[PDB]
Amino acid sequence: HGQVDCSPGIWQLDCTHLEGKVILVAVHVASGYIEAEVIPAETGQETAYFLLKLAGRWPVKTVHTDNGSNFTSTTVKAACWWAGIKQEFGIPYNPQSQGVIESMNKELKKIIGQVRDQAEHLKTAVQMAVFIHNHKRKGGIGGYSAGERIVDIIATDIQT
């Protein structure tokens, strides 16, 4: 659209679960474009590889989550480090403002039940799942897809 949902370099990272294997959802808060790897293990070791990877691919000013324990490993601390990531959030006592946010952890988890049959494994499945999401365009005088907006924002050399 333009002057978007939130800040250009903001993600929400949340290890998830399904069929004993932990799906891992990276989400572009402002554009809903998400990325997701299926780690067999919820370790700071793994969360880092992700961020790192994501950092090399997109401008990540800061990241947040629903469970902090996650961001408390050196492996991980060291990663947001060697890459310039910071955790984000805002409420401090200040002038009027407001809000509410969401979890695509569902949409994604929804389109999975669906496609699995088609999918050979969770892996192949979460990846089709997302593929389809990021691709899914909902009419809105910008009938673009999550995938289609994330670019633009960044694209326009979005601010901070």
Next chain:
Amino acid sequence: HGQVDCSPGIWQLDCTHLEGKVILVAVHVASGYIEAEVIPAETGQETAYFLLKLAGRWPVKTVHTDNGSNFTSTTVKAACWWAGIKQEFGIPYNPQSQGVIESMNKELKKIIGQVRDQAEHLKTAVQMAVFIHNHKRKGGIGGYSAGERIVDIIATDIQT
């Protein structure tokens, strides 16, 4: 820049090697932005997961490579399939045109020797490696980075 190097949805995918482990380089021919996973195994199974994944993330009209054997597995054939990927290339008998292309498989392989010490493993290393590349800006009246151009192209809703 604008009217870029090649077509907006073009990649070059080439399984690589180093320290017994096969690095895997996805490269955005037109923008040099690259992605790379470290598969312990060079199997059509794995090449697909990659493409698939990459397809969910970027508009991939068609992909090429230096070794075709690679694109001859069902697992893989099935993947360029359920996702609309096609192999690409052009020479058929036609009007004057010309060219020459490259391999970032080197730059990447270069910045790795370097950083490893810093890196804990190839993995952590290829990922820093790339991070740094995509990030590396060379003066050019568009002193932008591989990472910075790939967006734009696509961004501008690039053609085909």
